[PDB]
Amino acid sequence: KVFGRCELAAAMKRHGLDNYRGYSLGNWVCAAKFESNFNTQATNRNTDGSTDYGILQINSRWWCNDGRTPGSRNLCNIPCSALLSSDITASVNCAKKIVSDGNGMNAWVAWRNRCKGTDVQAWIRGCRL
């Protein structure tokens, strides 16, 4: 599923992401836009052999199991394929664990490079929320 911007905002809000660990909803929309282009099926292989999955590009080195990242962890205790679902529940639950991990949203390189220190509320303007 490729979400619309306000559609994803609404879904993220309902799942508890607005102000989660102090990150306003626009942060999470901005992250999803630049990580996955709002596409729940997005996958990208990393140089270390791990792969990023889903709308928030969650990495198999730590967070999910994809059966091909030797020595990795599975901290969200889920198959990486669960992160590709049209339903974002599994991505949001795992994102909450990631953002709690110590480095906040810096865990998402795209967020740090393209969202951090910008007018992120812009990502939720015009939305009925």
Question: What are the tokens at 24?
Answer: 């306003």
Q: Is 18 annotated as a binding residue?
A: no
Is 35 a catalytic site residue? yes
Is 119 a catalytic site residue? no
CA angle 62–2–55, rounded 5-degree value: 15
60 binds Na ion (CB under 5 A): yes
# residues contacting Cl ion (CB under 5 A):
2
Question: What are the tokens at 12?
Answer: 């993220």
Give me the 42-71 binding string for Cl ion, x by CB under 5 A, dash otherwise: ---------------------------x--
Residue 109 host element (H or E): helix 109-114
Q: Return the beta strands (E) in the chain as ranges.
A: 43-45, 51-53, 58-59
Tell me the helix, strand and coil percentages in the chain, rounded to 5: 40, 10, 50
Q: Given the complex with Na ion, which of 74 and 81 has the nearer CB atom?
A: 74
Give me the 51-80 binding string for Ni ion, x by CB under 5 A, dash otherwise: -x----x-----------------------
SS (H, E, C) 21-34: CCECHHHHHHHHHH
Residue nearest Na ion, Cβ-based: 72
* Active-site residue (options: 7, 35, 87, 119): 35
Taking CB within 5 to 8 Å according to partner kind, which of Cl ion, Ni ion, Na ion, none is near residue 52? Ni ion
Binding residues for Ni ion (CB under 5 A): 52, 57
Annotated binding site for substrate: 101
Annotated binding site: 101
